[PDB]
Design a protein around this nucleic acid. Structure first.
Ligand SMILES: [Mg+2]
Ligand SMILES: [Mg+2]
Lengths: 422, 451, 448, 422
DNA sequence: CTAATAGATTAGAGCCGTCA
RNA sequence: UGACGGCUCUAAUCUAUUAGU
DNA sequence: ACTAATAGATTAGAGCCGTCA
RNA sequence: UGACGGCUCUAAUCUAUUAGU
């Protein structure tokens, strides 16, 4: 027999009110037939009149929006509806649901004013309840409510372009590995040599002061030009410790433990990197934390390095992509690399106030995304390299550390449908 | 090559014992859990505030549009989602008139300015509650120009009387006309308005005394806890210690989410740990709550924190463990640079992926790209959170799944997910309110008052 | 051979500005004044008490009948008269201790037993209010002697309404004696019990059943009554409480001035000057701030005469010209009147005037429409005298007649005495049966 | 066959009154058709309205208000009503009703008031009763009430039976007036006639002590037998005071005030009444206040006086009447009595316990009404008299007071109709 | 006992944008 | 104080070592 | 001097009963 | 404490005299 409560709606026209109404109607009992619900086939009004209107429909719920006059589909549906209304001679067959406001009786379709219907303009919960009681008073058949069916249907229909898939993908990290180290770390004794007032950071090579163990990665005679009175000392009293043993954590003596030694090495590599950035034709900017390194304008070929942008202009100022680094040692010897944006008033002189710096950083970085960040970081790291495969951090006369320019690569299993676009 | 482990997204409960993921769609489809039906409300403010509140209140009934319904869903109406009544014909209103003499700020010592400004509203509310015959559920105070600690003091001085209160500014409600007065536009909610209505309605309904939704993937006999220290240095003495906690328990039938609070103090400037004697009382009270509620001692207890535990203060915790309960402690950190970049495209890594460096430490991605919403939660490429099992023995992946599931309970908002677990968030939420004034003993441990 | 006088019966207001006489008929015909819809409830007691309360609450929803419905009208059902929901599915409940180890304290020190018993319920209610997540309106404490006073006294600070019921009252069908005799027989009253319980529950939930509709602007009514406190050794004898009836620009104001002003001496009841000054100042200030103007006229009701020097202190506070007419009400004067023929006594509303000041008023008689007599025996009148001030006696008679119908505690046709004195006598013991409290609440629902 | 009644009203403005009327009518029993309660959704309203006003209508009461004066629908509906009135040949079809009664008369409809109408300004239940009696007089076909009505029909009207009729009636009070008094009050003095220890209350005649004087009511030599050594004293020094001079309050003196004299007179009359009441062949019972006087068993014919029972036998005990008297003189010199019942076991010796006395009192007095109390009080006050006119009260040798045996009467002009007996 | 280098580990406190 | 997140900028303390005891 | 006492006329507490012919 | 009324029983002050240093 007929049990489906057909309700008409403007599927192509932008409408989002029929979906939840139909969902709660089917979850509240009787079945509902909709065009937007059964969106799995493409055909004109052929099966509708063939099956439901003629034989498989009890009531109709023709809605009445503002743009119903222009749409010919609703007019054809209303014509078929009045034909069947004449066929069964039942007046209560067409209830013109009204939602919008601009429908004026003076300017309205000449045929829709035949009847009056429940009003959904005020609040459609009251319309829901009055529709339910009107349906009850006319002995409309309805099955006992099984809302799990509605939940399952909602899960099924709204699934395209969602959820996860099994596609494979790869990611590149923000770290950079360390592939070499000097063979041994040295501690020298100078005592009577070194003046007890002058600063040690000014040396051409990184070296820091301990109680007696003057820490170095180079020989015991490499500071002669910087400073005199060093040839009256013997190298037999110096101390050397293997790098593999200290790195493995096995080395330990009474005076020094392992963690202090690892911290010493981290400080050494940090200072070495900071010193090495002196002769790479770049400038530096000072922050609350460690320095940032930015590139000058014009020094690079038409502001690009292998078809990529690093220095640009924003309305009046100029923006540069600067980086900062910090050595880490726990999981593997690597370098944290962080990206910042530096602003200048013409390209040679930096804007002074920090507040406008922050505002300009926000304004410029508003509309950047994953690809741009990754590309710029990779390009800057590659350009900073002095070799086609790695980077040499110069620690001594002939000793150096090697850092590769290929970040760690990860990959997983789960993924999604990438071209979401919007 | 090192892989990434994936964790399935949990699900939350709704009315009629149904399951969904996004709270907005579930609420719009199913409904809240318990049935309350009274939102008798009262306001306090000038005439303009009253008329603006009335206008917004009757506006909220109609359906509201959003520009991208795929990302931010619809709001059909208050009577539909909640099944309650909230009108403008059942309100009580008390004038503030144009006294306004405090506006000269006394030209100095703004502390007493804040004192007097908060005192006016506090005395009005107290007198109205004590003398008036009518019954009121929540109060919406409307304030028009520059102040610092109004919010903390207002809720601090009203804690004893235990009256819920919500604070609103008519600039937010009436952003349509509060546009550029000289060429400086301020707000524009055209792209968002439905979201604003959603959030305000959810907050008001929760304050009224209703439970919108609850989690449904908890394990029986398992407790939870939070911890955070607050800095109080307005007085000369170095105090540095304000330890609160929250509790999320599985009752015999439902759930329980409350706070265990009493300001525990500590000398010394930078000693962020806890004294051996004081920890005993905190653990004893936390244990006793479950013992009295569930007629038995808990089986497993998890402690969450943002700092590590020393040896002696943790050993003090062991003397209170009844028979064998394991007090596994977890430390969460939110600053470690491991930005992972997708190889190709323009969309970042999607949430749910975790990285394990060892049996203790882990990186968890609570923020990413949600395929269902077809949008990202973070503006730029997201950064993960570091999770470390400090003391005790447990399984790392299970802890990861539990903390991931704990991020979907934020009753102050209606967002798909939260960056950090709520158990940490609410302790910090109540810490400043408690430390605004130290003249309370045995404060309420509910949630309507502090939020 | 003198002449009696008749005073027309006043009327009470209802919904849509309707007026009637019988509160039950008016409520059943139109309904309450304001619209409220939430009766979320919480009950503390044993399991048997909870199940009895549930059974009675689900019973209430259906209409009930009385043997003589022409006298006492029937009850149609809660959903019809009030138009609000109050069901048994949204009730919160916390069990009391089952074994009740406090039972043997019944024969022990009475004060310690009472203190422990009240403390248990007080702590349970306080913890429930301060910790639980649900919201409740009123607490229906169920019990299975200076106990009702202390429970309400200690709850004054927290400002939470409550209402006390007994198991035997709700379950009189089965809670008979052990010798085959019904302790309570409610067959003839069964409908009226539901009526009064429903009215009290609705009022304490924040609603208003009815209000007066024949008041004059600019007139303030004030009452006073003294309570005796001698549990402590010091002779105090002075506990002055008061109410206030005001006509707001739209509605009415019904609250009570509070703060038990004291006075030394044993039997010196009248007053002290400074306390009188403070009382009058506070009363005047309340109306002045509420209505933005000083009251035109003030009437001072009392049940005992007062002296002149204290009355002079009262006069010293009169703002411009307000006349503080003081009225003395006494209840024990034998002037029984017998009907000449028949078997029905004299109806209410009659009055006897003997001079410019004294009068007898018959507020107790038989109602013609109800066809029944309020008093069981031949009624007796009440004596009214004007002590200090100048006014018109008949106006005072009709005003005090109109003031005897606003009793929210019950649903009777009329009350014997004005409710202004009754409510102060109701709150005096609650104020005086505990430790000193500063600035107590001014709402009646807390005390009642 | 036409049963339902069409109610015309201004729907956009007034709906509550129509709902009230419809609910009252359906609760009464008559079947009613209305607009918003039965049929408005999803049908052509004009066809249904016309067929209802043409086929199945009996009365056509309408709602009149200033808002509905210029509404096209109701006025055209009323035009159809006039057209069908000119076809049915029955003038009892339209009964207009008014809700608003604060408008000038020169704005009314062209003709709506030509028939009999009712007003609702005063109330709504009284107008409902007016419409009900109009319906009853016009013989509208009745409807089945399911044998449950006549309960609302008791209270359908605002006033059930209450109204103050103008009939005359009388009442008998509980006070008895003193119609005479002896001439002067006396103050004797010797300071040695009596010892300073013995009690004056044992004297055969009332008298009291005031200062060195003896205040009294009879001659000075009347106490010779009880107190010897008195006749030898002079009687000139005694003081006489007129009774009328003090009863009017005009008299005043430094050594005695008027209110003190009134108190003395009250004391004297109370004591004299006790003294006389001692010798009237009756017994006395002691209460917290002054005694009460009752009658022994078997001292009258068949335990009654003037065919009115005064002593009765209960299930086990015996009940007797009793009165207690006190004199007051503010509004007039009068004596007021109060009635009580005293219980004994046979009629000689009475019960002792107070609780059983109270219980028996309540049980016996449960079912006594005004007539019985009045008749018993009148009979008891009549029997106690020594004369057919009044009661004497001797104070001394020859002076005496008279008390009338007829209570003061009060007549009233406003009363009720009847208790209908039944 | 107080001051300078440096690492790793904590808390506050403002200001801009709304997921292409 | 309708919410959320991304930056930027200021402080403590704890742990080797040196010098001003 | 306040301790008793015998009156008139107020003013407050408690403890039991019936239910509106 | 469901709530109203009708009684029955206790005590205490405020006046005005006279009895005790
Ligand atoms: Mg909030
Ligand atoms: Mg009560």
């Amino acid at each position: 027999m007929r049990n489906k409560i057909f309700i008409s709606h403007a599927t192509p026209e932008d409408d989002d009110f029929t979906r939840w109404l139909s969902l709660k109607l089917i979850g509240l009992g009787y079945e509902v037939w909709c065009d937007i619900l059964f969106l799995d086939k493409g055909v004109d009004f052929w099966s509708t009149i063939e099956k439901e209107i003629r034989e498989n429909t009890c009531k109709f719920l023709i809605v009445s929006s503002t743009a119903g006059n222009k749409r010919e589909g609703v007019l054809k549906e209303l014509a078929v509806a009045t034909k069947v209304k004449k066929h069964l001679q039942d007046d209560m067959f067409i209830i013109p649901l009204a939602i919008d406001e601009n429908l004026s009786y003076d300017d309205i379709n000449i045929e829709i004013v035949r009847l009056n219907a429940i009003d959904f303009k005020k609040s459609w919960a009251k319309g829901l309840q009055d529709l339910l009681d009107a349906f009850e008073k006319q002995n409309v058949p309805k099955k006992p409510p099984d809302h799990s069916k509605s939940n399952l249907l909602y899960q099924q229909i709204f699934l395209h372009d969602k959820q996860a898939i099994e596609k494979e993908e790869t990611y590149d990290s923000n770290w950079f590995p360390i592939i070499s180290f000097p063979n041994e770390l040295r501690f020298h004794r100078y005592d009577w040599r070194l003046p007890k007032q002058f600063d040690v950071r000014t040396l051409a090579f990184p070296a820091i002061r301990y109680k007696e163990y003057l820490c170095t990665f180079a020989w015991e005679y490499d500071f002669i030009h910087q400073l005199p009175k060093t040839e009256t000392y013997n190298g037999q009293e110096s101390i050397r410790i293997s790098t593999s043993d200290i790195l493995s954590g096995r080395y330990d003596t009474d005076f020094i433990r392992n963690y202090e030694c690892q911290r010493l090495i981290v400080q050494l590599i940090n200072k070495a990197f900071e010193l090495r950035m002196k002769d790479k034709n770049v400038r530096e900017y000072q922050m609350s934390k460690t320095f940032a390194y930015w590139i000058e304008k014009g020094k690079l070929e038409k502001d690009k390095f292998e078809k990529i942008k690093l220095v640009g202009k924003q309305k009046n100022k100029y923006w540069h992509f600067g980086i900062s680094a910090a050595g880490k040692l726990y999981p593997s010897p690597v370098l944290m690399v962080s990206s910042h944006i530096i602003f200048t008033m013409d390209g040679i002189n930096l804007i002074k106030s920090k507040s406008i710096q922050h505002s300009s950083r926000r304004k410029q970085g508003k509309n950047w995304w994953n690809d741009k960040w990754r590309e710029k970081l990779l390009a800057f790291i590659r350009f900073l390299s002095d070799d086609q495969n790695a980077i040499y951090l110069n620690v001594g006369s002939e000793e150096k550390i090697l850092i590769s320019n290929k970040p760690l690569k990860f990959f997983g299993k789960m993924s999604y449908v990438t071209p979401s676009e919007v | 090559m090192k892989e990434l482990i994936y964790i399935e997204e949990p699900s939350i409960l709704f009315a009629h014992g149904q399951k969904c993921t996004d709270p907005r769609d579930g609420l719009a489809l199913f409904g809240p859990l318990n049935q309350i039906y009274g939102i008798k409300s009262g306001v306090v403010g000038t005439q303009k505030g009253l008329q603006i509140f009335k206008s917004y209140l009757d506006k909220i009934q109609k359906p509201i549009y959003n520009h991208n319904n795929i990302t931010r869903p619809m709001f059909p109406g208050f009577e539909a989602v909640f099944g309650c009544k909230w009108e403008s014909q059942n309100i009580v209103f008390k004038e503030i008139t144009d006294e306004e003499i405090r506006r000269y700020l006394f030209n100095a010592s703004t502390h007493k300015r804040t004192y007097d400004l908060v005192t006016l509203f506090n005395d009005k509310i107290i007198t109205a509650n004590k003398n008036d015959e009518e019954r009121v559920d929540v109060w919406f105070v409307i304030v028009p120009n520059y102040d610092a600690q109004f919010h903390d003091q207002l809720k601090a001085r009203l804690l004893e009387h235990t009256i819920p209160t919500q604070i609103l500014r008519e600039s937010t409600l009436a952003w349509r006309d509060f546009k550029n007065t000289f060429g400086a536009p301020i707000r524009d909610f055209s792209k968002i308005e439905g979201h604003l209505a959603w959030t305000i309605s959810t907050a008001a309904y929760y304050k009224a005394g209703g439970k919108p939704w609850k989690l449904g993937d908890i394990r029986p006999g398992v407790c939870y806890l939070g911890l955070v220290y607050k800095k109080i240095e307005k007085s000369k003495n170095p105090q540095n210690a304000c330890c609160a906690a929250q509790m999320f328990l599985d009752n015999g039938d439902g759930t329980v989410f409350k706070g265990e609070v009493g300001p525990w103090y500590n000398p010394e400037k930078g000693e962020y740990h806890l004294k051996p004697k004081e920890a005993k009382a905190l653990l004893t009270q936390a244990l006793e709550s479950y013992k009295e509620q569930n007629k038995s001692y808990p089986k497993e207890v998890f402690i969450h924190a943002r700092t590590r535990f020393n040896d002696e203060e943790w050993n003090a915790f062991n003397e209170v463990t009844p028979k064998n309960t394991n007090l596994v402690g977890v430390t969460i950190t939110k600053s470690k640079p491991l930005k992972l970049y997708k190889t190709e495209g323009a969309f970042p890594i999607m949430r749910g992926n975790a990285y394990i460096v060892d049996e203790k430490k882990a990186f968890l991605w609570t923020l990413g790209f949600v395929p269902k919403l077809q949008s990202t939660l973070s503006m730029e490429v997201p950064n993960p959170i570091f999770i470390e099992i400090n003391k005790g023995e447990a399984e790392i992946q299970q802890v990861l799944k539990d903390i991931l599931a704990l991020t979907k309970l934020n009753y102050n908002a209606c967002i798909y997910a939260d960056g950090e677990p709520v158990t940490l968030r609410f302790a910090n939420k109540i810490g400043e309110i408690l430390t605004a004034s130290t003249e309370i003993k045995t404060p309420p441990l509910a949630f309507k008052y502090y939020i």
